[PDB]
Amino acid sequence: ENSVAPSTGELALEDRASLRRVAGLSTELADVSEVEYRQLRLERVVLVGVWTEGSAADAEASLAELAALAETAGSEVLEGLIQRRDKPDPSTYIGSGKAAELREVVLATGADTVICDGELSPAQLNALEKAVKVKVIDRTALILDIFAQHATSREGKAQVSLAQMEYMLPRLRGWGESMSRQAGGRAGGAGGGVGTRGPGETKIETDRRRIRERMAKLRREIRDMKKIRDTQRGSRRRSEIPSVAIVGYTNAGKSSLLNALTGAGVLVENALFATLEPTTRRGEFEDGRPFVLTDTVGFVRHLPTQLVEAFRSTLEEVVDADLLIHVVDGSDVNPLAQINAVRTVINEVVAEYDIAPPPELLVVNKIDAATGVGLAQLRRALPDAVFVSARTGDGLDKLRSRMGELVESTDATVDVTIPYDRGDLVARVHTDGHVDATEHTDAGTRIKARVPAPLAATLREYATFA
Amino acid sequence: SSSRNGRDSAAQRLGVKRFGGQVVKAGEILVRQRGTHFHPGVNVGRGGDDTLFALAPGAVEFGAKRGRKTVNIVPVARP
RNA sequence: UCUACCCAUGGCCAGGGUGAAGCGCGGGUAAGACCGCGUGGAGGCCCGAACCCACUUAGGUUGAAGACUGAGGGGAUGAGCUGUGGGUAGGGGUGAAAGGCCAAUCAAACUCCGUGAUAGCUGGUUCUCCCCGAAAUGCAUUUAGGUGCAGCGUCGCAUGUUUCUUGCCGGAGGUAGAGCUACUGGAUGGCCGAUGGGCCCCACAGGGUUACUGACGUCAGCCAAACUCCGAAUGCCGGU
RNA sequence: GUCAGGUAGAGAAUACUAAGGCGUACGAGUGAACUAUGGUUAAGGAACUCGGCAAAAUGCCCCCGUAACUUCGGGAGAAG
RNA sequence: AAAACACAGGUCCGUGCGAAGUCGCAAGACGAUGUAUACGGACUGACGCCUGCCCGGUAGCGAAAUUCCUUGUCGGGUAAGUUCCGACCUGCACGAAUGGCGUAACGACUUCUCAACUGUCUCAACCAUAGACUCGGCGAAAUUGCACUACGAGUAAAGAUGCUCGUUACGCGCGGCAGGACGAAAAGACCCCGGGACCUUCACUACAACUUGGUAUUGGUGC
RNA sequence: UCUGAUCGUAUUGGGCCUCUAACCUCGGACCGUAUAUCCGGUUCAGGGACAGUGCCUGGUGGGUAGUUUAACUGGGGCGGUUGCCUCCUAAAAUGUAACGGAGGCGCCCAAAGGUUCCCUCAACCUGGACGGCAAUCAGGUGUUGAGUGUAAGUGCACAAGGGAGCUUGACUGCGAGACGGACAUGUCGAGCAGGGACGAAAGUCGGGACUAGUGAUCCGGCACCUCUGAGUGGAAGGGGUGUCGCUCAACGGAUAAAAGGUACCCCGGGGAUAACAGGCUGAUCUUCCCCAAGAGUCCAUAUCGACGGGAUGGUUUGGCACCUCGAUGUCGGCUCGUCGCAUCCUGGGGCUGGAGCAGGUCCCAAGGGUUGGGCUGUUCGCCCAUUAAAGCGGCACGCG
RNA sequence: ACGAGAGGACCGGGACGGACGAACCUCUGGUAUACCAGUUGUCCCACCAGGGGCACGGCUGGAUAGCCACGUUCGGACAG
Numbered sequence A: 001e002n003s004v005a006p007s008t009g010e011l012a013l014e015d016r017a018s019l020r021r022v023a024g025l026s027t028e029l030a031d032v033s034e035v036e037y038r039q040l041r042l043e044r045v046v047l048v049g050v051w052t053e054g055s056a057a058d059a060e061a062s063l064a065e066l067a068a069l070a071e072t073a074g075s076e077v078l079e080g081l082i083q084r085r086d087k088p089d090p091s092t093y094i095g096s097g098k099a100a101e102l103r104e105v106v107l108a109t110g111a112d113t114v115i116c117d118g119e120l121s122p123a124q125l126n127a128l129e130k131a132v133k134v135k136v137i138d139r140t141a142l143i144l145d146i147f148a149q150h151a152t153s154r155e156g157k158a159q160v161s162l163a164q165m166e167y168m169l170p171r172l173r174g175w176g177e178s179m180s181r182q183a184g185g186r187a188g189g190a191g192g193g194v195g196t197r198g199p200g201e202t203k204i205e206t207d208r209r210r211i212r213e214r215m216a217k218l219r220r221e222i223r224d225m226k227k228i229r230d231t232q233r234g235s236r237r238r239s240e241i242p243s244v245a246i247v248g249y250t251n252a253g254k255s256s257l258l259n260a261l262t263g264a265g266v267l268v269e270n271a272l273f274a275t276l277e278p279t280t281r282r283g284e285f286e287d288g289r290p291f292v293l294t295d296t297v298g299f300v301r302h303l304p305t306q307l308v309e310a311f312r313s314t315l316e317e318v319v320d321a322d323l324l325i326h327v328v329d330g331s332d333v334n335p336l337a338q339i340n341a342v343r344t345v346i347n348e349v350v351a352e353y354d355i356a357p358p359p360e361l362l363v364v365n366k367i368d369a370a371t372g373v374g375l376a377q378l379r380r381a382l383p384d385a386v387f388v389s390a391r392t393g394d395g396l397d398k399l400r401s402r403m404g405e406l407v408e409s410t411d412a413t414v415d416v417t418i419p420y421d422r423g424d425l426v427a428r429v430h431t432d433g434h435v436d437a438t439e440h441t442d443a444g445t446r447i448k449a450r451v452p453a454p455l456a457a458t459l460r461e462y463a464t465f466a
Numbered sequence B: 001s002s003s004r005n006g007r008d009s010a011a012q013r014l015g016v017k018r019f020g021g022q023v024v025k026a027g028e029i030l031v032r033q034r035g036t037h038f039h040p041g042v043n044v045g046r047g048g049d050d051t052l053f054a055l056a057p058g059a060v061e062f063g064a065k066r067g068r069k070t071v072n073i074v075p076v077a078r079p
Numbered sequence C: 001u002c003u004a005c006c007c008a009u010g011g012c013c014a015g016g017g018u019g020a021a022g023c024g025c026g027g028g029u030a031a032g033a034c035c036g037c038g039u040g041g042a043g044g045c046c047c048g049a050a051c052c053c054a055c056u057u058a059g060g061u062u063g064a065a066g067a068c069u070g071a072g073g074g075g076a077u078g079a080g081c082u083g084u085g086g087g088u089a090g091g092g093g094u095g096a097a098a099g100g101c102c103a104a105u106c107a108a109a110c111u112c113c114g115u116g117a118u119a120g121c122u123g124g125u126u127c128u129c130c131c132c133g134a135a136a137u138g139c140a141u142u143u144a145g146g147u148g149c150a151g152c153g154u155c156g157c158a159u160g161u162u163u164c165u166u167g168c169c170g171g172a173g174g175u176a177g178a179g180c181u182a183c184u185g186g187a188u189g190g191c192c193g194a195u196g197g198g199c200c201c202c203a204c205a206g207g208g209u210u211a212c213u214g215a216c217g218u219c220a221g222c223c224a225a226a227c228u229c230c231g232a233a234u235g236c237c238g239g240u
Numbered sequence D: 001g002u003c004a005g006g007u008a009g010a011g012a013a014u015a016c017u018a019a020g021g022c023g024u025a026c027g028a029g030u031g032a033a034c035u036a037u038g039g040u041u042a043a044g045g046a047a048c049u050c051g052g053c054a055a056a057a058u059g060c061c062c063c064c065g066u067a068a069c070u071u072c073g074g075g076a077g078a079a080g
Numbered sequence E: 001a002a003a004a005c006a007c008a009g010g011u012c013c014g015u016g017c018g019a020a021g022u023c024g025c026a027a028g029a030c031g032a033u034g035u036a037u038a039c040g041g042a043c044u045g046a047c048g049c050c051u052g053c054c055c056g057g058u059a060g061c062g063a064a065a066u067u068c069c070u071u072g073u074c075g076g077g078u079a080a081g082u083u084c085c086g087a088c089c090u091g092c093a094c095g096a097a098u099g100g101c102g103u104a105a106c107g108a109c110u111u112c113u114c115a116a117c118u119g120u121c122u123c124a125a126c127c128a129u130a131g132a133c134u135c136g137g138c139g140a141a142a143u144u145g146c147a148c149u150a151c152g153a154g155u156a157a158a159g160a161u162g163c164u165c166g167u168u169a170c171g172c173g174c175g176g177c178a179g180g181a182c183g184a185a186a187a188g189a190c191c192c193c194g195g196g197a198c199c200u201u202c203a204c205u206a207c208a209a210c211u212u213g214g215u216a217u218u219g220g221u222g223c
Numbered sequence F: 001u002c003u004g005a006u007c008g009u010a011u012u013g014g015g016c017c018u019c020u021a022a023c024c025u026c027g028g029a030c031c032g033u034a035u036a037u038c039c040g041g042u043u044c045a046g047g048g049a050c051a052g053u054g055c056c057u058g059g060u061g062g063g064u065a066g067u068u069u070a071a072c073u074g075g076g077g078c079g080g081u082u083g084c085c086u087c088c089u090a091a092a093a094u095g096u097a098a099c100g101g102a103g104g105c106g107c108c109c110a111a112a113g114g115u116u117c118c119c120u121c122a123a124c125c126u127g128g129a130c131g132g133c134a135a136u137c138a139g140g141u142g143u144u145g146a147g148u149g150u151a152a153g154u155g156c157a158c159a160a161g162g163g164a165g166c167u168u169g170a171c172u173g174c175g176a177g178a179c180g181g182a183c184a185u186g187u188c189g190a191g192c193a194g195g196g197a198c199g200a201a202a203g204u205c206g207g208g209a210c211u212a213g214u215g216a217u218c219c220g221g222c223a224c225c226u227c228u229g230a231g232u233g234g235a236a237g238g239g240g241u242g243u244c245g246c247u248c249a250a251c252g253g254a255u256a257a258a259a260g261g262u263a264c265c266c267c268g269g270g271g272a273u274a275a276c277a278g279g280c281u282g283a284u285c286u287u288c289c290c291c292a293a294g295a296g297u298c299c300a301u302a303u304c305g306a307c308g309g310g311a312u313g314g315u316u317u318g319g320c321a322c323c324u325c326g327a328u329g330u331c332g333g334c335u336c337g338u339c340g341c342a343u344c345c346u347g348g349g350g351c352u353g354g355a356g357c358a359g360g361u362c363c364c365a366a367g368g369g370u371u372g373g374g375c376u377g378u379u380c381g382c383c384c385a386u387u388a389a390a391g392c393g394g395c396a397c398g399c400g
Numbered sequence G: 001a002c003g004a005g006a007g008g009a010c011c012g013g014g015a016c017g018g019a020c021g022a023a024c025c026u027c028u029g030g031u032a033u034a035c036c037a038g039u040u041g042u043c044c045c046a047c048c049a050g051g052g053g054c055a056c057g058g059c060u061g062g063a064u065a066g067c068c069a070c071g072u073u074c075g076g077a078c079a080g
């Protein structure tokens, strides 16, 4: 093969564009700091950053995302080497001799989890399993494992189980049997689809008949839960109350932003995919216009297509929506990538549901914990994005003002001189309505309130002309 | 999917063969045992495999010496 | 004498169609390949009877018939179909090959004989009453639905009872129960008080400082089948 | 295996007939269902069904006229 | 009845002649009254295509006709369109330097779309004939432990005419239907066990089919 | 006849090359013979001491043949196992099964066997440069701990554990009695020869702390014997004693010698045993509650409901293997039904999370009805056009 | 009713339906094996004319009755 199909140019192919070692970012630093119960995790991880269809920063950020996923699911991540190639291998996933090199790397580390970011096909999964003798990290399976461990409600659990079964069905042969054998209780392998403890002993049922039956059952159930959620949201839909959806990337506040803009106490954890069910709550604009602020599930760069049902609630909230508060954090590697991923999912939803793109109020948080390297055009490159940093109370008033300005009012401004013999007709104006510039004269007042539509028809009583 | 077990040795039919009060002949096996659960008492020998046998004719008796159970043979009065 | 193939010698293939080279040329043309008009009548050529076959369908399916009938269907000058007379014979023949056919039977035809083959497998085994009366267990087994031995049923010996039941007496157990600070694996508390991280006094001497990871130990509390400091009841072995 | 009338017909097909030979060996009846074999069928027209299975349809002679492709022979009785 | 066999063409191997190869113990025979342009055997199965720097080097080529294609995307075809047809597709591929692609004609081959046609169907109706049915004559059959042989819910060797408790039911026919009698038929072909047979083979052991010694057979010299 | 070369006569068994006479030729001619591609004879020609066919002998040898190709098994296959030892199961004697729970094996030791004698730390301090979780060490008690050829019951400072001497209990060769356990296996008192230790002191101590560390018989060896010796003056040709040879590991060992395929199959049987259906069960499946955490814009219960819990039903996949293997016909479609309600219209309650309305979610009350097509083996589904709706199931997944 | 709209009723009262079923044959339409007519081939009735047998009732165009559906009429109810 000295000159056969000149791909094997220099021994290991792609002299420097192949597996190399420069220590990279080395991912997170998670080591033994609390000496207690070694029965914790799945050993150390090594970064192998593929630049395919991207740059070094993009690959590093993506693999850091994968390592954060792994650390949330368990495992440990404290090393970085390099590996690059502009051809996702059909047979393997890391390369011709890169597979054996990765086997040597995992043997030297003493671990069964390093990196295999990106959704794989069954061919790639089983070939890499044969090559290295142990699974390492599959991105889709790892996201599904995080969702399985974080599933709380029956709806979330059923959605995650259906997603895992949809992912398992095509790849039930090699990877399927391997993870059926696996009893260590790790990402995917006995990961379960429930939550704490979970059904690891059976996992995704690793059996064609059982998987298909369970998928059909969960599909019927998810139809039922879609109907149930339709009934639950009917009250809001019929009230026509302004609905504001907090969309954005995983982490990046969002849940914190909800708990700040309101008095809520929704789960706010530093781990990824802490919120699996969208949650709605009261909100009061500065002008008094009530609205519904809803925290949603967090998106990632390439959301697995199996989580369609898991994210259907969030997508429906986006479809209804009236402001789309887009929450991002400036304390990440190039938050514009986060912005772009969330924007692409939003645009996909808009195209699917054939609706006008609702406003998108861009908000950045964690600014207090940001490095401040950018003066006004790098840290605030966006022209009109809001900066809040929920933790230390600041900028939230500006966020509320932008919310109120962007959300178009359905009320109508009126000048009604309600007599003092009515009483109720002015008390209700105060109650359902936004009074301002009310005259103190006991004779015919002139209340310049922004009354809702039904009250706007009771003007001819004492409307006057000006 | 199978079981790694399934083996077992033959039961060695150990234990006491002549209990207290039984009249035995010299050389009669009194206890088949592993080790000295019972120790050779009076007119009782200990075999290579820890088999306690009567050294003299008489009746089997079980005693305790220094906190150790012993098998003795009490001579039987001639009729 | 069926059928497969072959050999010899005969026979049959209604009707209709299409139109394979040499003559003369308009020619092509120096000349040739070759176009066309006539002639000629080739072809495992076409349509289609007899004939041979057997694709579809319906019927038949104790049939009219142990393979057929009706309606369609294929070949129908050919590697055609056929009559007569022959040849090849069984582990052999023949096979455009399907284990197809070789007399309604073929992964080795049929008849007779060996022969009343053998079968740990099914089945059957025919009159009566009197006495007694099981087993479905153990060991072994090319053994597991078989068999050998033992166990358990059926006359004469010894026996007066050695059997068995009850009482009492002597006996070894480690089960049931618990108990675990009695061992091997666990459980809420504070404790002189382990690394002590941490404030540090500011010693790198040396020392309190421990919000928190919490040593041994200790405090009532709890479990075990392969735990036992204990430990029955029964059962068993003897004697009476 | 031989002979092979007539009229239509290309014909030894087919229909009807001459000569000749037969009515062939259970019959008589009876508008049951149902089965079989034929026949017809409004309006649809493959919606039947595994499948146009079966049926239905085209069908002959003479004039015309005949495609893709082709091994230049064909396709071809194209089709119309 | 086919896509299988055969086939014309091809390639390889064997055979120098009572050849090889076959039938035979042998003689002998076919091969063939043939003689490497011929016979036998093997495998393909008309016909056409399938060489890239050097086929002096990495070395079998990287094009194309290559459809596993699951290829998704998109369409064409249906209102819903399978077979299938196209571009985009799919990366070291991948499967064919001779086994893969084409290929007119042909096909009771498999699959599909059309036009026409229709009782295939919506959805069936009517007519005739042969049965069926009635009368006369002749006159079987498989099957059969029985019998003045119900239904329900139970029970039972776990699916009952025969048992239980009830419910129903006058006796006997005739023409029909086919739900049961675990209906008849064939001592289940499936599965297992025991045996057999035949087939395969680098299972065992043999035997048929070839070399060595000396018999037949053996003289000297140049040695 | 040696310390014993050296040449010569015949014989001699091979190898090269040769001519002819055996033998061979389906090469010619002639003859028997009128007939004759037979056959035989004669002759020539050619192989021509060249090749050949018997006997012997290695080798290749599915070309042919006879056969083998284990069993257990919650059917069979696949996988695993097969003998021995230890433990638990095992229900306090013994014994006790399962494809029950755990392990070991099947060796090793000439000084880890015998005897005689003797011992002595498991963890704190002071410490002990180095040398802390450790030294060579010293004390105390830890009270019999502790640890100790290889898993249970034992053995301890009465040492089966740890050291030392002997010189070879390395106790071997002849062994009443008793016994424990089908054969097989296992225990030892004791008597005799010879020794080993301890000796003064006694006269005392039969491989290993003990249970695994193995393989019957046959057939063969190999050493010794006061046996036999196919008429024997006699010997050579077999036995006895002790020892050897089997992963005969399928370990009671069918052969010294053996793998498969069968849907081309056949026969003898089996519902002793699988596939269908039935039956039991109900893990799975299906349909159903709560102290309700939480979601539902305000709020557990309009709608839902996690973590847990409890059942129904017998429509799934199973588990079992109880009827049926001297036959209980399968999926789908057609035809014809019949039944249940677990509701796709008709009546209500709540939500009115419709404040309201058109609508709709949820939970309580079978008479009828519940379409036609395309793609589907299609049990499933998806799609097209409708519909008031295009229900879910049982009936041998009703009905050949 | 809402009383902002968008949209838009319950309950009652009429008209016309779809599917299913029953009866019936006036209509429509199907069938029609002793009806009528046309017509091909053939053979007969001696011949012409006119008819008949056979060829699916030879074929074709109609076709009363009966039987039918695609046709007609009626039904599901109203009340207790």
Ligand SMILES: Nc1nc2c(ncn2[C@@H]2O[C@H](COP(=O)(O)OP(=O)(O)CP(=O)(O)O)[C@@H](O)[C@H]2O)c(=O)[nH]1
Pocket (backbone or CB within 6 Å): A249, A250, A251, A252, A253, A254, A255, A256, A257, A267, A268, A269, A270, A271, A272, A273, A274, A275, A276, A296, A297, A298, A299, A365, A366, A367, A368, A369, A388, A389, A390, A391, A392
């Ligand atoms: N310093 C800082 N930390 C913040 C800020 N906003 C959020 N965080 C932290 O980041 C973490 C992100 O978790 P969360 O707020 O739930 O983000 P999220 O988007 O809901 C995670 P998911 O989307 O998967 O549910 C929180 O633990 C929070 O403490 C901020 O403005 N500043």
